[PDB]
């Protein structure tokens, strides 16, 4: 069946920027899918976006700037102590210059980087660069 | 698409947007609740009752109008169909198969088909039992089926 729609939505989107789509329609959407989205948006990867009210679980449409190179999730969302960071930064990110490894915390959801600010982080969620 | 590594499609049914009751219709929740329980008393499936209220008395979605789902309405009014359509029917055909098999003790495609159908029933029991929506000592074997036949 379906799982981690964040992943469903995410790749559907990558496939977008990769194919050169002008905009994308993500079918199954959730708070997570949206938060991640406004985090990419806030950092300037995706453009303006609209959430249509599917009386079941909303559908979102994201405008595509053309700067997204890749944005995926990470299989089981392992736990990650602040000490476990460089491991993943050198692992997932294409450089020490596009630090975008989204994590889930108790302090909500922060950028790979913000988690060092707040000083907590926790489970990995996804990445984008 | 259930027990099918190969076959799969989309039957239909998509509740329209507007969550309110149709304009043209006037019927205090109660009005319907009567028809519903009356119809039910005659011996009807909440599954079938709803069908009437749509085909016959233009009530698209009883839930939207009452703020009550059929089976609930029925249960509140003592008119609750003991065993759920779900299980009931599966067991029905599950049985029909057995009868046919007897006089055709050789029909293999049917032995198989029953195996699948009996398999499902064990899946519902697991479920309906876990939602304390069916006594734990429930057991469909051959006697549970013939028990309902009487």
């Amino acid at each position: 069946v379906k799982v981690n729609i964040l992943a469903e939505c995410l790749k559907d989107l990558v496939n977008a920027e990769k194919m050169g789509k002008k905009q994308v329609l993500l079918r199954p959407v959730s708070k997570v899918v949206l938060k991640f989205l406004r985090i990419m948006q806030k950092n300037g990867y995706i453009g303006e976006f609209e959430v249509i009210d599917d009386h079941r679980s909303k559908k979102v449409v994201v405008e595509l700037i053309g700067r997204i190179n890749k944005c995926g999730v990470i299989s089981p969302r392992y736990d990650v102590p602040l000490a476990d960071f460089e491991k993943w930064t050198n692992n997932i990110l294409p450089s020490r210059q596009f630090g975008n490894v989204v994590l889930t915390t108790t302090y909500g959801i922060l950028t790979h980087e913000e988690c060092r600010k707040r000083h907590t982080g926790g489970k990995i969620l996804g990445f984008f660069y | 698409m259930q027990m099918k590594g190969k076959g799969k499609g989309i039957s239909g049914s998509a509740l329209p947007f507007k969550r309110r009751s149709p304009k043209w219709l006037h019927m205090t929740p109660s009005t319907v609740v009567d028809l519903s329980v009356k119809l039910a008393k005659k011996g009807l499936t909440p599954s079938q009752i709803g069908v009437i209220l749509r085909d016959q008395h233009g009530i698209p979605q009883v839930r939207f109008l009452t703020g009550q789902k059929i089976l609930r309405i029925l249960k509140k009014n003592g008119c609750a169909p003991q065993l759920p359509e779900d299980l009931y029917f599966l067991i029905k055909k599950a049985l029909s198969i057995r009868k046919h098999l007897e006089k055709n003790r050789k029909d293999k495609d049917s032995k198989y088909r029953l195996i699948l159908v009996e398999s499902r029933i064990h899946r519902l029991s697991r479920y309906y039992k876990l939602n304390q929506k069916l006594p734990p000592k429930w057991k469909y074997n051959a006697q549970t089926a013939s028990a309902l036949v009487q």
Partner: protein, 141 residues
């Protein structure tokens, strides 16, 4: 997904799988099955022995030659050994019944491409390194 399962709750599975699918390695399968202990040296690096006789063996495929070899009897092990005597005149020093020290040739298994069923090298005669006997100014008895 691929074959391997990616669950945070399914570590056990992956674990047992690796321990299992791992027997497919010979290097593993080898040391794991106390195989090293059953060879003629009994794991050992070297072994002493008595010369049972100097025999010669023929080269294989594109080569044709009389290889110098000594049949040795290992001490505590007590096995018949096929041992290749190195360099040129070498066998001229090995007197029958003397004590010899033998070691393998490149990873215990395949003999040098040329040799047939020989798996050992001879390094000492009466406890005198061969090389030593090979160069005049060194030693001789």
């Amino acid at each position: 997904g691929v074959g391997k399962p990616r669950g945070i709750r399914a570590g056990r599975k992956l674990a047992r799988h690796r321990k299992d699918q791992r027997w497919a390695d010979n290097d593993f399968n080898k040391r794991l099955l106390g195989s090293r202990w059953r060879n003629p040296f009994m794991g050992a690096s070297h072994a002493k022995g008595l010369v049972t006789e100097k025999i010669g063996i023929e080269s294989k495929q594109p080569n044709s030659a009389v290889r110098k070899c000594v049949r040795v009897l290992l001490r505590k092990n007590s096995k018949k050994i096929a041992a290749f005597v190195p360099m040129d005149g070498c066998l001229n020093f090995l007197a029958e019944n003397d004590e010899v020290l033998v070691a393998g040739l490149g990873r215990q298994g395949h003999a040098v491409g040329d040799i047939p069923g020989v798996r050992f090298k001879v390094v000492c005669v009466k406890g005198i390194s061969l090389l030593a006997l090979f160069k005049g100014k060194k030693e001789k008895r």
